[PDB]
Every structure is written in structure tokens, then in C-alpha cells.
Symmetry: C3
Subunit: 337 residues, 3 copies
């Protein structure tokens, strides 16, 4: 992580990341069964286990509608079965509950569709070099969050669904992020604003550079950006001379000339850009002293650790997160009997 | 709420909203610990409580993989423990269940990570004036949704996670929404369409106006828009003369000249725009009478309460939501024995 | 499904789909009430049912904060109530659980807010012709997903919420998808790239064509695209001569001329586009033999069934999903006593 301030265009580039990109989809098929329940002597009467079985049977029947392939007297013994049924058959119930809640597909691969043991084995079988496989196992919280389970169908008392794990093929390719703010000059009152429109992520692969334009498109897990190959716009590798020289007469860079000053604050990974002109007062302050200085009229770059808040005409911006309070909560004890 | 129809460009502007913008992030750290279970004689022999404990231990162990800090016989007394364990330790299990379901992070702050009592106290401690704090307490429903919990790690039988509440610094700043439709003139069979491209929200703050271009970006809660400061494009405060005069020779407004007529319907907050030319028949009708009139060839604005359905060549559009049926459902009674 | 390769612009169009568009919103109001529990003698002394009731009361009280209307010893008989209470009042608890988890609104209509019997009846009452109603019943999986429940408020022991089902008015209107890749010509070492910008979905309705520009906007369910009428950009029906002839002097097609070659792979529904120039070696290989051939320098279209992997300078792309392993899992049996 190393953020550089470019004063000729009022923008910053942070080049310390490594890119991991998806290059296909894996697939596993699961079949979860309810499990045998010992026969009841009565077989026709209201019992806690029978009511529990009926609810499970009814839940499966309703769940069959949201599919993809085909459709679209108290006794001590009874209590033990009712509790035992919901304990031994817990993974099955959770899968049924999750699919019903999301109505067909879960947003992410929870730890009930595919346990860790099944996840590690699946990753090791993917068609990628050893380098990619090692990285995926190191941080498997992202493969789960990038996949999505799909319900195939329901037959009898079993459930069939697909996981569709992601597959990463390009890893450890250096890349950066670019943030820009307006840079308006002035002669006698008539301004000339130049704002760079090539703002967002920027990562390289396969002899080309991708341009995920939304900061939310690519997640961050330290020195790793888990970009999704669904919004990236491929651009020529020559689209880097803009940083060195905005014009450079070589690669036309996307800029938007203006005529009216704009005052705004843009937050960077390790700082923020403060630009304000002609009317609004700017100042940088911390949680200790809020009178550090008044920013001069222009585009100024302030480090994250140098200041904590920037007030653009009575509007704090909180460069960095603010820590609150820590709580510790413990449940009540479960005494015998 | 007051919608105005501008006939020189076939667009409408609604000026009745108040803006609420985010200016940072808060943070709280929680540590939920499982309750204490009294020593059980004959730990070797299975029991309905040992099985429940084993499932909890297994669930926590799997949950450790998706983290961020380090990784990535039955007696009457026995039954009470199984029921009691899941009752006293209800908050802990729900937090474990939610994190496992979403695989590491919960999309919103449910009412198990942070109860109302904890949420109210945290909001009162934020670094914002009394005005902002009062508003957040008044409607805390749109605080949990904008936030998101993060699982830090799992150690022993305890779970550590972060909430990261949002912080609002700019409130009660009036703003509006602009919707536009094509306005094509006819000249001896030759058309000239002019469709505005500055369509979306438009809110003001810190001597500038933001331009969230997607209606889904900002969520409305009456006379309040909880816009997210992640897609807003800052624009000059002079970007308002377009409504008064499309050209105005002052702020170049984004328009897209065309040559072929386009027939479409745009739904405004309190009405809709109906444009249809050269071939498709327009008509406005209600659920009572559907022959109110036939709209003339051109851009026309119809109030929400004036009509309910707009048919563009046999395609009803349902200006406003249609109410269905109300159901009342009660669960079966529970009787002793 | 029929994919055509257009060599004059290095793009492909697939014309085999049928459109399904939303034209309003439906609405149902539900009121779920907790069941009646027979009064238990000695309410003062704790019991496994009183604790269960207290948790339910506490859960409802907290849920009241996230609303929209107003705010923002153990015996054998006792155990049966605790188990029976959570069985009969299963739908109510699930609705409470879902609303609390999502903090006010559920992303989709799970199978606890509206059962299939209620959903089928509601769909039959929508104000649409018999043709639209028949389609919605046939595949109701993509009705719950497009809808979303809303919690109105909590009064006493009852819960009131709204479902807001979607309504489809335009069906069986043929439409297609267009994917394009750079087509750079070489002239004495000087390149001239032409990449189409009219990339995405393209569906027709009401004498106009919509242009959902994101592949994720429209979800495919076979020969049906359930596009959401929230991002569609209406375009003239004459915006189709681009495929036949790029210029055609009638509808200016959106292209972006360039000067530097770009190498990339675009995945079409039934194939992919491979373009690579001046430095990176292309090759197509299957899971059987990976030396099928080396693609020549240019824009080439390869069928999905012809090859499985595309390597752009040591980067496999996995044209089609790769099948993994199938698991069958059964829960432990439950035996009496
Ligand atoms: C950035 O690029 C501009 C554009 O080419 C450079 O300005 C040119 O510099 C050359 C000298 O190498 C002159 O012959 C041209 O007349 C200049 N043109 C213009 C429009 O200024 C500039 O030198 C480059 N470097 C910097 C720091 O701006
Ligand atoms: C909107 O702006 C246009 C452009 O400035 C105005 O049209 C001009 O009006 C002045 C009179 O003040 C004339 O001297 C110019 O010749 C006009 N130019 C053009 C291109 O029309 C227009 O009057 C303004 N008002 C309205 C309602 O359009
Ligand atoms: C595609 O459109 C272009 C543009 O009109 C056509 O090129 C023209 O063809 C006419 C013949 O009908 C000539 O008189 C013009 O001089 C051509 N103009 C240019 C710029 O080439 C072209 O023939 C059409 N068809 C194809 C296959 O490109
Ligand atoms: C239980 O009884 C049913 C009654 O039809 C029978 O089919 C089944 O084989 C018996 N055993 C189990 C384990 O369900
Ligand atoms: C059981 O007793 C032992 C005695 O050392 C103690 O270490 C252990 O924590 C106890 N277990 C429970 C569940 O109370
Ligand atoms: C139970 O007793 C209460 C008195 O506290 C009474 O209000 C209620 O009607 C009785 N019946 C119930 C709870 O079913």
C-alpha cells in the first residue's frame, strides 16, 4: 500500500494491491435425506413426533413449488423423539430453512449446504495450477461469499441442490486504484474545472487492464482485491500514461472540462482529497484538536493519520472509522434439573 | 411533495423531500459467550444435552473457518437441559446462525447482534450535533439496513464480531427528483427527439449538489431520502437552470438528440409521463371506467389520482399500486396435556 | 436459441428468448396472531413455558422498533407446552425470525409470509389477461424473488406485514442479447480498434425496444428473461440495423474508436469471442486434448461445444461450467428410547 498524490490533475493512485479474478464456475450436486424414524405402535393419533413429521412433510411439499428441474396425550418417549429428530436431522432442516427463506436460491454458500471438509476437497479438485489452489484454501471465506446455492428439485423426502463454487485463475497480478477530484483554476472569476472521469479500480491481466468503475465492485481482504469479472471494462495497457502526464498526446484520457467550481471531499484508501473554492471554508481537525489549520483555496491532499475530520462548511466527514464501545455478554447458566 | 410538469422538455421535478446523507462509519465490538452447563455425571454415556453441546461445538468450529482475524437414553432431567440450553442461549445461537447463513458477514444489523437498548446508547455517543442524533433515534429502522455486521473471529466458546453502524452528518437539506421522457416534434414526416440525460435524484450539501443517477440508490421514508454517499456524482449548484430553461447558455445540460420517435411511459412519484407518436394508440383509464379519453399525440402529464392505468397499445401500466385481499391467520391453541 | 456471429464488427447476437416484463405491483396484507396458551397455575413460579412466552414477548417488543406504521423446575406436562408452542406457532415464529434477521423487510417472499395456496389465489386475481396469469402460475419461483415483504407494525401479540407481489403484463415478446469485442485492424504497425458500446440485453415492447445494459439485470429461466423495468433505457426500434450494417446511415450506433490493440475473451450464451493481437498467444483446448489449434491473430468465434477452455497467454477461461462430484448424505436414524 503506497498512495501517491498527483498535483497536475488533483488525483491519487494507491498501488499496493494484488488481484484475484474469476475465470469460470465449478459445480457440485448434493442430496440430503431426512433419515429413518422408527415405526410407532399407534400410527394414528396426535403425538409430538407425528406433528413434527407432518410439519417437515408439509414444508418439503411447499418447497417443491420453488424448484428448478421439475416445478417452475403426553409421553416421555414422544418428547425424546421430537428433540432427537430436530438434532440428528439438523443439516437437512437448515438447508430447507435457508432455501425457503430466500425462495429457491441462497445468496452465499452457508456452512450448512457444504461443510468445510467438503469445501476443501472440492477446491483441491479444481482445474487450476497449484498456486491458485493454495491461495483459495488460505482464504475460503471469499469463495463461499462469491458462490451461490441453487435448488434443483425435491423428490420424496430428499432435497437436491447445486453449489456452483467460483474458480480463480489469475492471482497475484499487481494493480491499483485511482481517485480524482475537481481541479479548478481562476483568472478573474471565470473558472476552468478539470475532473478526471477515469475514476475507479484498475487491474491488469492477460496483456490488458480491466476497469471495474465502481469501488463496491471489488472487495478487499488486505493486499488482495477479489474483483468480479462481470463489470470490468477492458482497456489498453497504454492507459497508464494519464497518471504520469494527463494529456501525453498518446492515450486520450477521459476528462470533463467545466466552468463552475465544485467543492467536495473524496476519501482515499489512506487519506482524502479536499477541494473547495470561492465561498466554503475548509479546515482539518482531529478528535484531540479541531483547529489544526484552515486548508487553502485549492486541491489539497491530507494523510489519513495526519487528520481525522474535514469540515466543508460545517460538515464533518470522518476520514477514518471511529471506535465505539466494547461489550461482553454471557447467557444465563443452565443449572441441573 | 409538489410535482411540476415542464412542457419545454417533457420532464417533471418533485420538490418535497429532505436529504439524509452518511458522513463516516461508527464501530462497536461484541463478545458473545455461551452459557455454563452444570457438570453431567457419566459424560461418556450419550444424552440429549451432550448431543446439543456437541452440535454447538461443531458449529463454532466450522464458523471459525469463515473469519477475519486469524482464518481467512433420555431422562426427564436430561430433556430440561436440552430445552433450557436453547432458551437461555438464544441470542448466541441466533448470531451463530446468521453468520453461518451469510458466510461471514450479515447484510444488515438484525435484532440479535445489537438489541434496541444497545443501539440507542451507541447512537447517542456518535460525534454529531444533537439535531442529527435526534433524527437517527426517531427512525432507527434505516440504520440497521445501512449497517452491516462483520465476524472478527471465534475463540474458545465465545464469538467476536463488529457492527459498524452508519453515521449521518447532513440532514434536512431540501432536494428533489427529475424524470424525463422523449419530446419529439414533427416536421413534414421528419422527427427530432430530445431526451434529457440528467435523470435521477438531485440533492444538495456542502455548497454542491449530488446526482445519484439511480432511483434505487436512494430509499424514501416519507419526506426523507436516505441516499448512500457511494454513487453520488457532485455537480455544480448552477446545474439547476436546466429546469427553468433547457439551454440557458449557462450550464450545458445533458440531452441526446434523436431522429426516430420513441413511445414510453415514465412513472413519477405523483403521476407519470405518457409519450407516444406515430403508430401506437394511447389511452388513460381507471379501475372504474377505462374509456376516460385517448391521449393526443405528444408528451402528456397525467396525475396519479386522475387515472390509474395507461395502455400503450394494449399494455396496462398500473400508475399506482393495486390493493388485494387482507388475511387474518391464527395458530392452533396449546392446551395442557 | 440461435447465436449468429457478425464478422464486420466482432460481435454476436442470440435470438431465442422471450421477454417477461413487470408493469406494476400487487399487494396483500397479512395479520399473524400468536396462538392461545391455557392459563398455567402458579404463574409466578418459573416454568419452561413461561420462559418461552417471555422470549416471544421480548422478541415482538424489539421487533416493534423496526416498523413502518408507528415506530420508524420442569415437569412432564410443562415440557409439552414448550415443544408444542414452537410447533403450532411455527409460521408466526418464522415470520418474526425473518423480519428480525433482515431488520424490517425480507429480500424475497419466503415460504412463510405467503404459502403456495395463498400465492396461487393472489395471482389469479391480478388485473391481467388470462395469458399473463397462466404464465405466472407456471413458474412462480420468479415471482417471490422479484417481490419483497414489508413489516407494517406490531400490535399486541399480532404482526402485520405486506408482501407487494410483482405483476407481469408483457409476455412472449421475442428479444435477444448482443455481445461485442474489439476488432483492431493493422496497417503498417498502426492499429485502429472499433469496439461497440451497445452491449447488453435488447427486448421489445409497446412499439419500442429496451436496452438493459447489464447482463445481471435480466435473469434467464430457459427461453424466458425476467427483466426488471428499472434500468431499461428505451431506444428506437430502428436501433437494429447496426447488426445488419454497422453504419447504415440511419441509426448512429455507439462505437468507440481506438488506437491500441486490446486482447480479451467475451463469453456468449452459446460460445465466446476470442480477440488477441500483437504479443499474446491464443489457443483453444478441451478437457480431453489441449492442443486443438492456435487461434490466428484476429477476432474469432468458437462454439461452446467445439472447445471448453481458452488460454490467453496462460490463462484458462472455462467456456462452460465444469462438473464436480455428487454427494449423497443421510442423517442419523432416530430410534425409540
Ligand atoms: C505532458 O504532455 C504535454 C503534451 O505533449 C507536453 O507538452 C508538450 O511538450 C513538448 C515538449 O516535449 C512541446 O514540444 C509541445 O509544444 C508541448 N505541447 C503542449 C500542448 O504543451 C508536456 O511537456 C508533457 N509534460 C508535462 C510535465 O506536462
Ligand atoms: C431560454 O434560453 C434561450 C437561449 O438563451 C433564449 O433564447 C434567446 O432569447 C434572447 C432574448 O433574451 C434572444 O436575444 C436570443 O436570440 C435567443 N436565442 C435563441 C437561441 O433562442 C430564450 O428566450 C430563453 N427562454 C425560453 C423560455 O426559452
Ligand atoms: C453499409 O452502409 C454503408 C454506408 O452507407 C454503405 O457504404 C455506402 O454504399 C453506397 C452504395 O449503396 C455508396 O454509394 C456509398 O459511397 C458508401 N459509403 C461508404 C462510406 O462506404 C455500405 O455499402 C453498406 N453495406 C455494407 C456491407 O457495408
Ligand atoms: C415405518 O412404517 C411405515 C408404514 O408404511 C413403513 O413403510 C416403514 O418401512 C416403517 N419403517 C420406517 C423406518 O419408516
Ligand atoms: C466438569 O467438571 C470438571 C472438573 O474439573 C470441569 O473441569 C469441567 O469444566 C466440568 N464440565 C462442565 C460441563 O461443567
Ligand atoms: C388467562 O388469565 C388472564 C388473567 O391474567 C386473562 O386475562 C385471560 O383471559 C385468561 N385466558 C387466557 C390467557 O387464555
Amino acid at each position: 500500500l503506497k498512495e501517491s498524490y498527483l498535483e497536475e490533475s488533483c488525483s491519487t493512485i494507491t498501488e499496493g494491491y494484488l488481484s484475484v479474478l474469476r475465470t469460470g464456475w465449478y459445480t457440485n450436486v448434493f442430496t440430503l435425506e431426512v433419515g429413518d424414524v422408527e415405526n410407532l405402535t399407534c400410527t394414528d393419533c396426535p403425538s409430538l413426533i407425528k406433528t413434527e413429521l407432518d410439519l417437515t412433510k408439509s414444508a418439503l411439499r411447499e418447497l417443491k413449488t420453488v424448484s428448478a428441474d421439475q416445478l417452475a396425550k403426553c409421553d416421555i418417549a414422544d418428547l425424546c423423539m421430537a428433540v432427537s429428530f430436530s438434532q440428528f436431522n439438523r443439516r437437512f432442516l437448515n438447508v430447507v430453512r435457508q432455501f425457503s427463506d430466500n425462495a429457491g436460491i441462497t445468496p452465499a454458500i452457508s456452512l450448512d449446504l457444504m461443510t468445510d471438509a467438503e469445501l476443501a476437497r472440492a477446491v483441491s479438485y479444481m482445474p487450476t495450477s497449484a498456486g491458485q489452489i493454495k491461495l483459495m484454501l488460505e482464504n475460503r471465506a471469499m469463495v463461499r461469499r462469491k458462490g451461490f446455492g441453487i435448488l434443483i428439485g425435491v423428490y420424496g423426502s430428499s432435497v437436491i441442490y447445486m453449489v456452483q463454487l467460483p474458480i480463480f485463475g489469475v492471482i497475484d497480478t499487481p494493480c491499483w486504484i485511482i481517485k480524482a477530484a475537481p481541479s479548478c483554476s481562476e483568472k478573474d472569476g471565470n473558472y476552468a474545472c478539470l475532473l478526471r472521469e477515469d475514476q475507479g479500480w484498475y487491474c491488469k491481466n492477460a496483456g490488458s487492464t480491466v476497469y471495474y468503475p465502481n469501488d463496491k465492485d471489488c472487495e478487499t481482504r488486505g493486499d488482495h482485491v477479489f474483483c468480479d469479472t462481470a463489470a470490468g471494462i477492458n482497456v489498453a495497457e497504454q492507459s497508464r500514461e494519464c497518471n504520469i502526464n494527463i494529456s501525453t498526446t498518446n492515450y486520450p484520457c477521459k476528462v470533463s472540462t467545466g466552468r463552475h467550481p465544485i467543492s467536495m471531499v473524496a476519501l482515499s484508501p489512506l487519506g482524502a482529497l479536499v477541494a473547495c473554492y470561492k465561498g466554503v471554508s475548509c479546515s482539518i481537525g482531529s478528535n484531540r484538536v479541531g483547529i489544526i489549520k484552515q486548508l487553502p483555496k485549492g486541491c489539497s491532499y491530507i494523510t489519513n493519520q495526519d487528520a481525522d475530520t474535514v469540515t466543508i462548511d460545517n460538515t464533518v466527514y470522518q476520514l477514518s472509522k471511529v471506535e465505539g464501545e466494547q461489550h461482553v455478554i454471557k447467557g444465563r447458566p443452565v443449572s441441573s434439573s
